[PDB]
Amino acid sequence: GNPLVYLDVDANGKPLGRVVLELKADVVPKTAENFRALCTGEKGFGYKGSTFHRVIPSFMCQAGDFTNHNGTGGKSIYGSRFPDENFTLKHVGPGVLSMANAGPNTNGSQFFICTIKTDWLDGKHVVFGHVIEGMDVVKKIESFGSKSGRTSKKIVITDCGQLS
């Protein structure tokens, strides 16, 4: 079945709780596998101890730059970048999990969780999962963002991994 993974998130060292995500390995196996492995840390790098560096209220919460912590970095389990797998899954509403990118075929490790329907991204960002549980936690993260994307508190993935 599809992987169930988790992110435990704090704000300035205070727990906000757990986001549980389903990864759609049945539709985007390569993209799913990348995210799953970055949650477990099994390749010797990944998301644990990294940040949500760009959070825009009424839009999305962005994370995954575990090298530079500012949107310029990250890498995949495959190498520095990997192709756009497919655009089968769409940005249908809040809780969609999708890959951030710098253009076509530039997926690395950065990702975003939508807090609205972001359909203008369809065909441009690879959607690969959604929030199973903890949309309230996502909303808390969202609350520490700003229209610029800068966060007012340090938002940290203190733990992460795979439930099933």
**Residues with catalytic function:** 54, 59, 62, 101, 112, 121, 125
Q: Which does 161 bind (CB under 5 to 8 A by kind): K ion, ligand 4ZO, none?
A: K ion
Quick note: the x/- pattern for K ion over 102-141, rule CB under 5 A, is ----------------------------------------
Q: Minimal distance in Å, beta carbon 137 to ligand 4ZO?
A: 19
Chain residues that interact with ligand 4ZO, rule: CB under 6 A? 60, 62, 71, 80-81, 100-102, 106, 108, 110, 112
Return the H-helix or E-strand segment holding 131. Answer: strand 127-133
Q: Which does 151 bind (CB under 5 to 8 A by kind): ligand 4ZO, K ion, none?
A: none
Contact status: 57 vs K ion (CB under 5 A):
no
Do 21 and 8 touch, CB atoms closer than 8 A? no
Q: Minimal distance in Å, beta carbon 85 to K ion?
A: 25
Residue number with the smallest Cβ distance to ligand 4ZO: 100
Give the separation between CA 37 and CA 76, rounded to whole angstroms. Answer: 9
Q: Which of 82, 75, 70 is nearest to 106 (CA)?
A: 82
Q: Which of 82, 76, 78 is nearest to 105 (CA)?
A: 82
Give the separation between CA 49 and CA 129, rounded to whole angstroms. Answer: 22
Residue 152 φ/ψ, nearest 5 degrees: -90, -10
